[PDB]
Design a protein around this ligand. Structure first.
Ligand SMILES: *[C@@H]1O[C@H](CO)[C@@H](O[C@@H]2O[C@H](CO)[C@@H](O[C@@H]3O[C@H](CO)[C@@H](O)[C@H](O)[C@@H]3O)[C@H](O)[C@H]2NC(C)=O)[C@H](O)[C@H]1NC(C)=O
Ligand SMILES: *[C@@H]1O[C@H](CO)[C@@H](O)[C@H](O)[C@H]1NC(C)=O
Ligand SMILES: *[C@@H]1O[C@H](CO)[C@@H](O)[C@H](O)[C@H]1NC(C)=O
Lengths: 219, 328
């Protein structure tokens, strides 16, 4: 493969009749085309438009008008989708996609939330729990716990890493619980004795933080 | 005066729609009515016109000549209906107008309203019906199926994609007009040319194999502009396989504002956890249960209390019973 799609940010919250811009950074691009698929709750995923690079031409699919969805050039490697005059029926998860021969590669997606209600957009507030000596004694392993609480919207992306390995560790994530203007998520990571006393780092991405992730250093 | 058109809806290509228009404030009989259509904004085109007082001259435009029928209800109403040849390109905003001089020429049709939103969606001829979803124990073999309809199955390219919330859609395996594609080992696909079906076969199921499985069809012109047509998909949940009952390890952590009760490596998943301060339940406490890759379950019960407080986590995960208490 080798193709990599990057979509920032993870979520976009707007009121009706506003506009939204979604980014798709393509690394090592094989195809000249960027496809934009939409995932809505209850219906099958479908493609909205196909954007031609080097032509800067957005071709929408049947059922979608160019005055509603249109892609443009962002940076010199970014495809920028703009969805204008937002209605509630525009809410969904928007994935960009590129062909790699016979297989099609997708991005992690960007959730578009269009509500007819006033919203607050508050960032996650983390509290951490460090491993106890009792657990290291009777399990030969330590458990780190992170609780992100009181954030809006209900879209967050968290991951754990080890200082020097560029691949997130295998941790457990709970569901995003909450309602109204306050949502929470818990996540924990268990590591062994030979992995303990190694500087860890914890990341979380939220809409109220921009495109860069917030980082936390743990020892 | 006041023209209010009231019709239009979200339908699919090959449906019927009947548009109404309430006319109030003038002598309905004397004047003729008409219907207009605009793709998205302006450029209203005269598509239908009806004569005076349930008249005799109803003239349609070549756009809807053989699938339209305009009528009027003299109790303040005008009706225009499009037949089942209703495509997606005759979709937009429809307006209602009333006709209303030698040296002073006026516009023939006037008194438009806000229009009515009619959105006809296209109807896909590619039908894909996934089946075989449910809950599976780990280590079992998953076998999904797709009933395909409406296209040449033999020379088609059909794939299986895994959709999981928070993850990028992932291609598992597929088929084309040749031999096996990525069909060695865990993830496998096959086909039945007689019944126009494609199958997925995943062996040694793991917890990571949960998600929404869609079989997809590649349609287009054969270049990188082709699209994938997906079905609704079928949901697959993976449970840990049955094993010996294992009692959990309970631990208690603090963060000067909250309390975490850590319950590790128990089976079955049924347990009861409760956080008490002084014999009473604490302010907030929400449980989070998740199965581990080791085959057992873990749980975390978080709550909030002060640092200079006594708290007790009570865990009941069998006949057995466990209490963890921090004094003040
Ligand atoms: C029908 O499906 C088969 C199987 O998917 C296709 O054959 C496979 O084609 C891919 C590329 O399209 C080959 O993989 C390539 O390998 C190179 C070298 O590592 C890599 O740089 C490429 O990115 C790509 O991964 C693969 O070898 C080949 N055979 C397999 C998978 O068994 C075939 O092209 C499809 N179409 C037909 C037959 O018309
Ligand atoms: C881990 O962090 C501590 C900070 O106190 C630092 O002294 C140590 O060098 C770090 N470990 C590595 C491997 O850099
Ligand atoms: C438990 O859920 C409630 C729901 O209102 C929430 O307010 C509370 O913050 C949650 N507990 C923790 C420790 O975040």
């Amino acid at each position: 493969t080798g193709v990599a799609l990057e979509q920032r940010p993870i979520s976009i919250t707007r009121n009706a009749k506003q506009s939204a811009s979604l980014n798709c950074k393509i690394l090592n691009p094989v195809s000249d085309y960027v496809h934009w698929y939409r995932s809505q709750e209850g219906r099958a995923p479908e493609r909205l438009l196909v954007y031609s690079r080097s032509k800067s031409e957005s071709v929408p699919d049947p059922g979608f008008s160019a005055d509603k969805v249109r892609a443009y050039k962002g940076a010199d490697d970014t495809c920028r989708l703009i969805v204008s005059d937002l209605q509630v029926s525009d809410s969904g998860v928007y994935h960009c996609a590129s062909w790699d021969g016979r297989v099609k590669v997708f991005g992690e997606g960007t959730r578009l939330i269009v509500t007819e209600s006033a919203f607050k957009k508050k960032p996650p507030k983390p509290i951490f729990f460090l491993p106890t000596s009792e657990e290291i004694k009777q399990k030969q392993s330590g458990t780190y716990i992170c609780l992100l609480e009181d954030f809006f919207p209900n879209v967050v992306k968290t991951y754990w890493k080890e200082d020097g390995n560029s691949q997130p560790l295998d941790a457990q994530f709970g569901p995003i619980t909450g309602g109204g203007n306050s949502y929470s998520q818990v996540s924990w990571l268990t590591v062994k004795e030979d992995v303990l006393r190694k500087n860890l780092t914890y990341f979380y991405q939220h809409e109220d933080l921009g495109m860069e992730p917030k980082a936390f250093s743990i020892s | 005066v006041k023209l209010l058109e009231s019709g239009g809806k979200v339908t699919h290509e090959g449906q019927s729609v009947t548009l109404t228009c309430k006319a109030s404030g003038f002598n309905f009989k004397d004047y003729d009515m008409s219907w207009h259509w605009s793709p998205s904004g302006s450029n209203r085109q005269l598509v239908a016109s009806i004569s005076s007082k349930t008249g005799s001259k109803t003239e349609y435009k070549p756009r809807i000549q053989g699938r339209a029928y305009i009528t009027r209800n003299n109790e303040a109403n005008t009706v225009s209906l499009t037949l089942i040849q209703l495509r997606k390109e005759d979709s937009g905003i429809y307006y209602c107008a009333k006709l209303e001089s030698r040296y002073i020429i006026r516009e023939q049709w006037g008194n438009f309203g806000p229009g009515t939103k009619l959105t006809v969606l296209p109807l896909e001829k590619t039908l894909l019906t996934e089946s075989g979803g449910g809950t599976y124990q780990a280590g079992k073999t998953l076998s999904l199926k797709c009933q395909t309809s409406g296209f040449q199955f033999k020379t088609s390219q059909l794939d299986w994609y895994l959709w999981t919330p928070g993850h990028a859609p992932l291609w598992l395996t597929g088929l084309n007009s040749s031999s096996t594609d990525a069909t060695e080992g865990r993830i496998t696909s096959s086909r039945e040319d007689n019944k126009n079906q494609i199958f997925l076969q995943i062996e040694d199921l793991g917890l990571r194999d949960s998600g929404q499985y869609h079989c997809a069809r590649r349609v287009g012109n054969g270049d990188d502009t082709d699209k994938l047509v997906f079905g609704l998909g079928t949901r697959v949940i993976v449970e840990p396989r049955p094993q010996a009952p294992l009692s959990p390890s309970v631990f208690l952590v603090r963060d000067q504002n909250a309390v975490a009760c850590l319950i590790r490596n128990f089976y079955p998943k049924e347990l009861h956890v409760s956080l008490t301060s002084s014999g009473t339940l604490i302010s907030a406490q929400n449980l989070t249960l998740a199965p581990m890759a080791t085959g057992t379950y873990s749980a975390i019960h978080i709550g909030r209390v002060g640092e200079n407080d006594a708290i007790t986590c009570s865990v009941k995960h069998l006949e057995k019973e466990i209490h963890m208490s921090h004094q003040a």
